[PDB]
Amino acid sequence: GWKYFKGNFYYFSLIPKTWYSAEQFCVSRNSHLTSVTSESEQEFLYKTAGGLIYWIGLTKAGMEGDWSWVDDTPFNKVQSVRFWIPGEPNNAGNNEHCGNIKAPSLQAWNDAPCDKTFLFICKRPYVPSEPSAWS
Numbered sequence: 001g002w003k004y005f006k007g008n009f010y011y012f013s014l015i016p017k018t019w020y021s022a023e024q025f026c027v028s029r030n031s032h033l034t035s036v037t038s039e040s041e042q043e044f045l046y047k048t049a050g051g052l053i054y055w056i057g058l059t060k061a062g063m064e065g066d067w068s069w070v071d072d073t074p075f076n077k078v079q080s081v082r083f084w085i086p087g088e089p090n091n092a093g094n095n096e097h098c099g100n101i102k103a104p105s106l107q108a109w110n111d112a113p114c115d116k117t118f119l120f121i122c123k124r125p126y127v128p129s130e131p132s133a134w135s
């Protein structure tokens with residue numbers, strides 16, 4: 001059930017999980033909750049989501065509380081400003097440390113409590129099967 005888009009496969013779950021249980025599901029499938037690194041990718045994701053809320057790999061790290069991607073793609077603050085829902089992230093109740101895709105629009109992300117259960121999106125790169133590149 002993996003959908004393909006620009007060198008990566010994506011899994012849109014049918015079962016809701018907490019953010020971390022979702023990530024552990026993705027890891028069990030050789031993947032991670034999805035990063036988003038371009039306008040086209042954001043579009044593909046929100047359109048495929050179709051108005052339902054999905055956990056993505058957005059999560060807080062480091063002492064300052066900076067947003068980051070669980071797949072370890074460096075988080076580009078500047079290029080991601082357009083991807084949040086207006087007025088987010090707002091840290092409602094000071095307990096919103098994970099992020100989801102929410103609105104069906106380029107401005108789509110909300111921060112939400114990590115312990116809430118949502119559907120979720122996994123992402124894994126296509127890696128072709130080739131012999132050892134060492135020698």
Ligand SMILES: OC[C@H]1O[C@H](O[C@H]2[C@H](O)[C@@H](O)[C@@H](O)O[C@@H]2CO)[C@H](O)[C@@H](O)[C@@H]1O
Pocket residue numbers: 088090092096110111112
């Ligand atoms: O308006 C943006 C805001 O909406 C959500 O807050 C909900 C909450 O989840 C409900 O349980 C209930 O208390 O009503 C609220 C509407 O004000 C999101 O939780 C929040 O992160 C989001 O920013």
Ligand SMILES: [Ca+2]
Pocket residue numbers: 088089090091092096110111112
């Ligand atoms: Ca929020």
